[PDB]
Amino acid sequence: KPFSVPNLPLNTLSNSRVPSLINAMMISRDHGQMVQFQNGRVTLDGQLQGTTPTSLSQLCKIRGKVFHASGGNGLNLTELDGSAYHAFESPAPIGFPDIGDCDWHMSATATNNFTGSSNEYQILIKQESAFAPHLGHVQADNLSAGANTDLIVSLSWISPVSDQHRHDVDPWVIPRYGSSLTEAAQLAPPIYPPGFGEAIVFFMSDFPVVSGVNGMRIPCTLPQEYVAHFVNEQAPTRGEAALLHYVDPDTHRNLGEFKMYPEGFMTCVPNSSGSGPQTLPINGVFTFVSWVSRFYQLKPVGTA
Amino acid sequence: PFSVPNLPLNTLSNSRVPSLINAMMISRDHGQMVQFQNGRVTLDGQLQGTTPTSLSQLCKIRGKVFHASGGNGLNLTELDGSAYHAFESPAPIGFPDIGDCDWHMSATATNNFTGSSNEYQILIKQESAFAPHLGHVQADNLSAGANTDLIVSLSWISPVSDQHRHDVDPWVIPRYGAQLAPPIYPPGFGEAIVFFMSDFPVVSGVNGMRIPCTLPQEYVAHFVNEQAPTRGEAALLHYVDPDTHRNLGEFKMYPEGFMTCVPNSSGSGPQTLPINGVFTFVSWVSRFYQLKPVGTA
């Protein structure tokens, strides 16, 4: 079964870490040397990793039953379909947000007998001591729902931590899933740019971020729709890296070459300390050319 | 060669709201005609109506705030900021297609987002100032300054504000003005249109908190990707247990992008089937092909 990537223009596809259209590609020497995102993680032969869902309907979602306690209210987590969360299969429930070290402003709705405005709750989930999604619970501020209420929660926007230990949001980092009690079990492994002059390609989307280190932008390593494609195809990985062309869909012109590694991420070689894929159009399609060795030398992409 | 995704149905999304599929149903009182504008695509990958490739566009609106005496609103663009063309679709791509109800929505500023002051809970009613085909809709409780660019997502729906009805019927589409995706009818010989159901916050819904669609969203992206030529009048599918490979039932998928089954002696059809199954392409068949009844009596 031959390997392929979707024949879909980039700017029609979603970020795999927030539900937002891709509007740019970038490399980052500052942030792109090690990356351990937990969403948008899947092998080229279609093995899902981390908390990564097949569908965007699960992404940046939390489901749980409300608990009321002295130190504050919170949620006892389930999977989004309502089935039980287990602490062996993953760092958190599938689709749980993976943007660390920031406040999450979220919208929750009652899943049973939804009456209207009073069954929608604008809540704040902080990443402090009682943030323990791996153990099956998070503390939630400004949550007025009664005990044992079943809620589906959606990420609305993010902002600097409430406890003031930093004043910006760095979306390149992931949460501490097990709190200070333990490291999470099935974390999608760290990624490093392998290869000579290679930089990891990050697909960017706009999102409401207050004081972001790259402003209102969230990076990921695959479009969401690629994840569903690889999980569908399960094409055997027949080489060390997949050579791709980024191609204009009308003119058929090759706009640059890229390597996709089995771990499920892409790299390019920037032109002489340049911005690499950022100057390319965003309405192109990636296309599989051939399996190549990890040492295969890419032609530089972008301006100097 | 034509294929459908090898993905379990309960891992996939509704194509009319961003919510996991948790059921399949047929409907006598609602399945006699449907003209949903989202989740519409041909088997060879031609998008129709307002249907996006990606769920990130679904049930969202983008536009610039206008202030008016009759009421504030939004001058619509596409979700990527580019101009909406009325000759291309009945509304911008991904516009909600749930008619004859109130849309309660959450809007955020796309420029210099500061926090809670740039998030707005708005009500979009479907009255005379609802004109998506032109490129504008009236919004209540919208306090943002004039020309503010906002990205808006659907939070919940409820009975119309003017009270001309007291319940929500998600089987109907809005009055856009158009170049609508065409109506779908059951094709004959006791075939019933299969609807994929997802839960959504609906106040006083005709089927409770449930939204129907004709295709999982990820099937839409798969067909747009593959563009497999249609080589017959219907694609015969098996719904299969992925662990045991057990054939749970037969379904026809038509070129227009919808599925049918035959229920067993006036029964519920696909409703009693497990929701973690996978559809698989068997072969191209003619209109003459008669499906084995599915489900219980």
Residue numbers in the entry:
A (entry chain A): 230 to 533
B (entry chain B): 231 to 407, 414 to 533
Article passage:
The crystal structure of the native DSV P protein was solved at 2.10 Å resolution, containing a homodimer in the crystallographic asymmetric unit. All DSV P protein residues (228–531) were built in electronic density map. The two P proteins exhibited the typical huNoV P dimer arch-like structure with the P1 subdomains situated at the bottom and the P2 subdomain situated at the top. The major structural differences compared with other known P proteins are at the surface exposed loops, including the previously identified A-, B-, P-, T-, and U-loops in the P2 subdomain and the S-loop in the P1 subdomain. These variable loops confer DSV and VA115 unique surface topology from other huNoVs. We noted that the P-loop and T-loop on the surface of DSV/VA115 P protein exhibit a higher extension and the distance between the two loops becomes closer. Therefore, the glycan binding pocket becomes narrower but deeper, which hinders the binding to HBGAs. Through structural superimposition of the DSV P domain and HBGA oligosaccharides with other known structures, we found that the α-acetylgalactosamine (GalNAc), the A epitope, and α-Gal of the B epitope are too close to the amino acids on the T-loop, resulting in an obvious chemical steric hindrance. Similar clash also occurs between the α-1,2 fucose of the H-type trisaccharide and the S346′ amino acid residue on the P-loop. Likewise, the representative α-1,3/4 fucose of Lewis antigen forms a clash with Y439′ on the S-loop.
NoV VP1 can be divided into two major domains: the N-terminal shell (S) domain and the C-terminal protruding (P) domain. The P domains form the outermost, dimeric protrusions of NoV virions, which plays critical roles in receptor recognition and host immune responses. HuNoVs recognize human histo-blood group antigens (HBGAs) as host receptors or attachment factors that play an important role in huNoV host susceptibility. In this study, we provided both phenotypic and structural evidence to show that huNoV DSV and VA115 recognize a group of glycans with terminal galactoses as ligands.
